[PDB]
Short mmCIF file of C-alpha atoms and ligand atoms in Angstrom, two decimals:
data_model
loop_
_atom_site.label_atom_id
_atom_site.label_comp_id
_atom_site.label_asym_id
_atom_site.label_seq_id
_atom_site.Cartn_x
_atom_site.Cartn_y
_atom_site.Cartn_z
CA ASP A 1 0.00 0.00 0.00
CA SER A 2 0.86 3.77 0.03
CA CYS A 3 0.56 4.04 3.90
CA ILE A 4 2.74 6.22 6.20
CA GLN A 5 3.79 4.78 9.56
CA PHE A 6 4.09 6.25 13.08
CA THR A 7 7.27 4.64 14.55
CA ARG A 8 6.28 5.11 18.22
CA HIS A 9 2.60 4.01 17.89
CA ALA A 10 2.98 0.36 19.07
CA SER A 11 5.15 1.42 22.09
CA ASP A 12 2.62 4.21 22.98
CA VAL A 13 -0.30 1.69 22.77
CA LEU A 14 1.54 -0.75 25.09
CA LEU A 15 2.43 2.07 27.52
CA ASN A 16 -1.29 3.04 27.72
CA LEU A 17 -2.37 -0.60 28.15
CA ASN A 18 0.08 -0.81 31.10
CA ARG A 19 -1.41 2.45 32.55
CA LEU A 20 -4.88 0.81 32.35
CA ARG A 21 -3.49 -2.32 34.09
CA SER A 22 -1.87 -0.25 36.89
CA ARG A 23 -5.24 1.53 37.53
CA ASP A 24 -7.16 -1.80 37.16
CA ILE A 25 -9.21 -0.39 34.20
CA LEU A 26 -11.12 -2.90 32.02
CA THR A 27 -9.12 -5.87 33.38
CA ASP A 28 -11.32 -8.93 32.73
CA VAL A 29 -9.39 -11.81 34.31
CA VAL A 30 -7.51 -12.78 37.48
CA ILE A 31 -4.56 -15.19 37.10
CA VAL A 32 -4.05 -17.22 40.28
CA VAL A 33 -0.46 -18.41 40.92
CA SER A 34 -0.26 -20.31 44.24
CA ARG A 35 -1.64 -17.77 46.79
CA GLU A 36 -1.01 -14.72 44.51
CA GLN A 37 -3.60 -13.06 42.26
CA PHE A 38 -2.75 -10.96 39.15
CA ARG A 39 -5.32 -8.86 37.29
CA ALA A 40 -4.84 -8.45 33.54
CA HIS A 41 -6.46 -7.98 30.11
CA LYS A 42 -7.23 -11.29 28.32
CA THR A 43 -6.24 -9.74 24.92
CA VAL A 44 -2.76 -8.67 26.13
CA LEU A 45 -2.16 -12.13 27.71
CA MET A 46 -3.17 -13.79 24.38
CA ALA A 47 -0.98 -11.40 22.33
CA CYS A 48 2.08 -12.37 24.45
CA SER A 49 1.59 -16.02 25.39
CA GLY A 50 0.89 -19.18 23.40
CA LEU A 51 -0.71 -20.69 26.52
CA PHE A 52 -3.16 -17.78 27.10
CA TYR A 53 -3.88 -17.67 23.36
CA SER A 54 -4.96 -21.37 23.46
CA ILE A 55 -6.97 -20.82 26.72
CA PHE A 56 -8.97 -17.76 25.64
CA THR A 57 -9.75 -19.05 22.08
CA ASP A 58 -11.41 -22.04 23.77
CA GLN A 59 -15.22 -21.58 23.58
CA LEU A 60 -15.66 -22.48 27.33
CA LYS A 61 -12.52 -20.95 28.92
CA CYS A 62 -12.90 -17.61 27.01
CA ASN A 63 -15.75 -16.80 29.51
CA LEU A 64 -13.81 -17.54 32.72
CA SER A 65 -12.96 -14.59 35.01
CA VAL A 66 -10.46 -16.72 37.03
CA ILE A 67 -7.62 -18.90 35.61
CA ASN A 68 -5.53 -21.04 38.00
CA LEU A 69 -1.98 -21.85 36.84
CA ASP A 70 -0.12 -25.13 37.50
CA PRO A 71 1.03 -25.20 41.23
CA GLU A 72 4.69 -25.58 40.05
CA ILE A 73 4.58 -21.99 38.68
CA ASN A 74 6.44 -19.48 40.84
CA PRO A 75 4.46 -16.18 41.52
CA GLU A 76 7.63 -14.03 41.17
CA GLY A 77 8.50 -15.60 37.79
CA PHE A 78 4.91 -14.91 36.65
CA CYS A 79 5.04 -11.29 37.94
CA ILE A 80 8.32 -10.61 35.98
CA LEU A 81 6.74 -12.08 32.81
CA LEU A 82 3.45 -10.17 33.26
CA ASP A 83 5.51 -6.94 33.60
CA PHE A 84 7.42 -7.92 30.38
CA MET A 85 4.12 -8.47 28.52
CA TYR A 86 2.98 -4.92 29.32
CA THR A 87 6.38 -3.15 28.94
CA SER A 88 8.82 -5.12 26.64
CA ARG A 89 11.22 -5.00 29.68
CA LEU A 90 12.43 -8.21 31.32
CA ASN A 91 13.90 -8.06 34.85
CA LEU A 92 16.26 -11.02 34.34
CA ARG A 93 18.61 -11.64 37.30
CA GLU A 94 20.89 -14.52 38.45
CA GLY A 95 18.44 -15.31 41.30
CA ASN A 96 15.32 -15.45 39.12
CA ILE A 97 16.52 -16.73 35.67
CA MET A 98 15.61 -20.42 36.31
CA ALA A 99 12.07 -19.51 37.57
CA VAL A 100 11.65 -17.01 34.66
CA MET A 101 12.72 -19.60 32.00
CA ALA A 102 10.42 -22.33 33.50
CA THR A 103 7.45 -19.90 33.62
CA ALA A 104 8.17 -18.65 30.02
CA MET A 105 8.33 -22.29 28.76
CA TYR A 106 4.95 -22.98 30.46
CA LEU A 107 3.44 -19.73 29.12
CA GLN A 108 4.91 -20.40 25.64
CA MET A 109 6.78 -17.07 25.34
CA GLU A 110 9.39 -18.18 22.76
CA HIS A 111 11.56 -15.01 22.70
CA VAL A 112 11.90 -14.96 26.55
CA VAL A 113 12.85 -18.70 26.55
CA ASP A 114 15.55 -17.98 23.88
CA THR A 115 17.21 -15.12 25.87
CA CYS A 116 17.12 -17.20 29.12
CA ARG A 117 18.84 -20.14 27.31
CA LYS A 118 21.52 -17.73 25.95
CA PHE A 119 22.13 -16.06 29.36
CA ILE A 120 22.36 -19.52 31.07
CA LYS A 121 24.79 -20.82 28.36
CA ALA A 122 27.06 -17.74 28.97
CA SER A 123 27.36 -18.56 32.73
CA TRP B 1 6.21 9.35 10.59
CA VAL B 2 8.13 7.22 8.02
CA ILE B 3 7.67 5.38 4.68
CA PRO B 4 7.43 1.74 5.98
CA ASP C 1 16.43 -0.83 36.71
CA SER C 2 18.75 -3.58 35.27
CA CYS C 3 16.09 -4.79 32.71
CA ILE C 4 16.79 -6.05 29.14
CA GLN C 5 14.37 -5.05 26.38
CA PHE C 6 12.87 -6.91 23.40
CA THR C 7 12.79 -4.29 20.56
CA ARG C 8 10.00 -5.99 18.55
CA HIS C 9 7.69 -6.82 21.52
CA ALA C 10 5.28 -3.82 21.23
CA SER C 11 4.93 -4.30 17.41
CA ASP C 12 4.34 -8.09 17.89
CA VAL C 13 1.66 -7.38 20.57
CA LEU C 14 -0.14 -4.92 18.23
CA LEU C 15 0.10 -7.38 15.30
CA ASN C 16 -1.57 -10.08 17.48
CA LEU C 17 -4.25 -7.66 18.71
CA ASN C 18 -5.03 -6.91 15.02
CA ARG C 19 -5.21 -10.70 14.31
CA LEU C 20 -7.76 -11.00 17.16
CA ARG C 21 -9.74 -8.07 15.68
CA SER C 22 -9.74 -9.62 12.16
CA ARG C 23 -11.11 -12.92 13.61
CA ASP C 24 -13.56 -11.00 15.90
CA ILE C 25 -11.95 -12.55 19.06
CA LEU C 26 -12.75 -10.91 22.44
CA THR C 27 -14.07 -7.72 20.77
CA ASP C 28 -16.35 -6.10 23.39
CA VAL C 29 -17.81 -3.07 21.60
CA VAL C 30 -19.41 -2.02 18.32
CA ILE C 31 -18.76 1.56 17.11
CA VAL C 32 -21.65 2.82 14.97
CA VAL C 33 -20.73 5.46 12.35
CA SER C 34 -23.82 6.43 10.30
CA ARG C 35 -25.04 3.06 8.89
CA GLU C 36 -21.63 1.30 9.40
CA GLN C 37 -20.67 -0.89 12.37
CA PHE C 38 -17.07 -1.55 13.52
CA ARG C 39 -16.16 -4.18 16.11
CA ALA C 40 -13.15 -3.47 18.32
CA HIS C 41 -11.46 -3.92 21.72
CA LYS C 42 -12.31 -1.13 24.22
CA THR C 43 -8.70 -1.19 25.60
CA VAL C 44 -7.10 -0.63 22.15
CA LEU C 45 -9.56 2.23 21.39
CA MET C 46 -8.67 3.85 24.77
CA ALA C 47 -4.92 3.38 24.21
CA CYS C 48 -5.18 5.25 20.85
CA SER C 49 -7.90 7.87 21.33
CA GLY C 50 -8.49 10.61 23.89
CA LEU C 51 -12.23 10.40 23.11
CA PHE C 52 -12.50 6.61 23.74
CA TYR C 53 -10.29 6.98 26.82
CA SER C 54 -12.79 9.53 28.29
CA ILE C 55 -15.81 7.36 27.26
CA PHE C 56 -14.64 4.03 28.70
CA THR C 57 -13.29 5.51 32.00
CA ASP C 58 -16.82 6.82 32.60
CA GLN C 59 -18.52 4.58 35.22
CA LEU C 60 -21.75 4.31 33.08
CA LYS C 61 -20.38 4.23 29.50
CA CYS C 62 -17.62 1.65 30.37
CA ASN C 63 -20.46 -0.99 30.38
CA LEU C 64 -21.96 -0.11 26.97
CA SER C 65 -21.58 -2.66 24.14
CA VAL C 66 -22.66 -0.08 21.49
CA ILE C 67 -21.24 3.48 21.04
CA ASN C 68 -22.80 5.79 18.42
CA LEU C 69 -20.49 8.49 17.00
CA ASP C 70 -21.57 12.02 15.99
CA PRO C 71 -23.51 11.84 12.61
CA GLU C 72 -20.91 14.23 11.03
CA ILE C 73 -18.26 11.45 11.28
CA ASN C 74 -17.47 9.81 7.95
CA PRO C 75 -17.37 5.90 8.10
CA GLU C 76 -14.35 5.74 5.73
CA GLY C 77 -12.36 8.24 7.85
CA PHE C 78 -13.18 6.12 10.94
CA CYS C 79 -12.19 2.87 9.15
CA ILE C 80 -8.75 4.35 8.15
CA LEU C 81 -8.19 5.49 11.77
CA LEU C 82 -9.33 2.16 13.27
CA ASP C 83 -6.84 0.39 10.93
CA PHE C 84 -4.10 2.87 12.10
CA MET C 85 -4.90 2.09 15.76
CA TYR C 86 -4.30 -1.63 15.20
CA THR C 87 -1.32 -1.34 12.77
CA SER C 88 0.59 2.03 13.16
CA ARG C 89 -0.13 2.45 9.38
CA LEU C 90 -2.17 5.40 8.11
CA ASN C 91 -3.70 5.22 4.60
CA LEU C 92 -3.55 9.00 4.01
CA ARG C 93 -4.59 10.04 0.47
CA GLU C 94 -5.57 13.33 -1.26
CA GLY C 95 -9.22 12.16 -1.43
CA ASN C 96 -9.50 11.21 2.26
CA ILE C 97 -7.15 13.63 4.14
CA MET C 98 -9.90 16.14 5.11
CA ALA C 99 -12.22 13.34 6.43
CA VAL C 100 -9.23 11.67 8.22
CA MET C 101 -8.13 14.96 9.92
CA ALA C 102 -11.75 15.78 11.02
CA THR C 103 -12.23 12.23 12.42
CA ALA C 104 -8.78 12.33 14.19
CA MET C 105 -9.64 15.75 15.76
CA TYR C 106 -12.97 14.27 17.02
CA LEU C 107 -11.27 11.08 18.27
CA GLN C 108 -8.45 13.14 19.86
CA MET C 109 -5.58 11.34 18.08
CA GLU C 110 -2.96 14.13 18.35
CA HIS C 111 -0.17 12.55 16.22
CA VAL C 112 -2.58 11.84 13.29
CA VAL C 113 -3.92 15.45 13.46
CA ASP C 114 -0.29 16.77 13.34
CA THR C 115 0.68 14.76 10.19
CA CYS C 116 -2.61 15.76 8.43
CA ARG C 117 -1.91 19.47 9.18
CA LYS C 118 1.66 19.08 7.79
CA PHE C 119 0.51 17.23 4.61
CA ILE C 120 -2.25 19.87 4.02
CA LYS C 121 0.26 22.77 4.55
CA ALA C 122 2.61 21.18 1.91
CA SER C 123 -0.19 21.19 -0.75
CA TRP D 1 17.25 -7.92 23.02
CA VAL D 2 18.97 -4.61 23.99
CA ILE D 3 20.07 -2.56 27.05
CA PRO D 4 17.26 0.09 27.09
C1 LIG E 1 -0.64 -17.76 16.00
N1 LIG E 1 -1.73 -16.74 15.83
C2 LIG E 1 -2.46 -16.76 14.53
C3 LIG E 1 -2.05 -15.79 16.86
N2 LIG E 1 -3.09 -14.90 16.67
C4 LIG E 1 -3.42 -14.11 17.70
C5 LIG E 1 -2.76 -14.17 18.91
CL1 LIG E 1 -3.28 -13.21 20.17
C6 LIG E 1 -1.67 -15.08 19.04
N3 LIG E 1 -0.84 -15.06 20.12
C7 LIG E 1 0.20 -15.97 20.46
C8 LIG E 1 0.30 -17.32 20.02
C9 LIG E 1 1.47 -18.07 20.17
C10 LIG E 1 2.57 -17.44 20.78
C11 LIG E 1 2.50 -16.08 21.23
C12 LIG E 1 1.34 -15.33 21.09
C13 LIG E 1 3.83 -15.70 21.82
C14 LIG E 1 4.67 -16.98 21.63
O1 LIG E 1 5.85 -17.17 21.90
N4 LIG E 1 3.85 -17.96 21.04
N5 LIG E 1 -1.33 -15.89 18.02
C1 LIG E 2 -3.59 10.27 29.81
N1 LIG E 2 -3.57 8.91 30.44
C2 LIG E 2 -3.08 8.85 31.85
C3 LIG E 2 -3.97 7.73 29.73
N2 LIG E 2 -3.95 6.50 30.37
C4 LIG E 2 -4.44 5.45 29.70
C5 LIG E 2 -4.93 5.56 28.42
CL1 LIG E 2 -5.59 4.23 27.68
C6 LIG E 2 -4.89 6.84 27.79
N3 LIG E 2 -5.16 7.00 26.46
C7 LIG E 2 -5.28 8.21 25.71
C8 LIG E 2 -5.59 9.49 26.25
C9 LIG E 2 -5.44 10.67 25.51
C10 LIG E 2 -4.95 10.55 24.20
C11 LIG E 2 -4.61 9.28 23.64
C12 LIG E 2 -4.77 8.10 24.36
C13 LIG E 2 -4.10 9.49 22.24
C14 LIG E 2 -4.15 11.02 22.08
O1 LIG E 2 -3.79 11.71 21.14
N4 LIG E 2 -4.68 11.57 23.27
N5 LIG E 2 -4.41 7.92 28.45
CL1 LIG E 3 8.19 -13.67 24.15
CL1 LIG E 4 -2.32 9.44 17.21
#
């Protein structure tokens, strides 16, 4: 086509979606990880995760307001990945890398799994 | 704005 | 912080949100423009437009499944702007620029209004 | 991935 493109548009959209999350605006699901609860937008979760994409395209699960993750999933690993989904920023540290990689493999977040594998190989 |  | 960043994340999120829109997945509102109806995600509309942001943060309007725009709004101008919201690409042409600028001013999409003003000034 |  003959379109023009606004370079910062996608980043600005994601920044505003994170502002809505921080104010709990139009969040339509609670993700339960052990005792911890995380409010989010189903669409953002689907856009970032192969697991949430499969869950919310399912005719029965698409209507659930509560999703419970596997008890093996670490709440801190999930929190770091949820923050990444809404910001493009991953808080990857020596003390959390194993929990982050395991959670990203479960959530099916291919690019996060790849950088965790590379950072682990380096050490 | 750019030409994509 | 000591975060790492995935450059393509925001663009990949927006691309997936557009894929959900094209398949009509988790769309929660219909925008009526004259006779034409457009299905969309409230969160994406809010992230892109000052008008939708004001509408869906309103305690009564946040629950509406149908929003009717001012009858002066041109359906083609709205369609071009809705496509921009989900792609970062604006189909700006000599024959649509006036309708696009008027719709962007109404929707409060500041960056679109700025490029329309610049393109009009040049001609 | 980059250092932002
Ligand atoms: C694959 N597909 C057509 C599609 N359409 C819409 C959405 Cl929201 C979606 N999201 C999704 C699926 C798989 C994966 C991801 C997002 C991230 C990932 O690593 N794998 N995937
Ligand atoms: C201004 N603010 C705190 C905020 N938070 C969340 C959202 Cl979704 C939002 N969106 C929005 C508001 C105003 C404008 C836009 C988006 C685009 C624009 O040109 N003006 N604005
Ligand atoms: Cl990823
Ligand atoms: Cl804009």
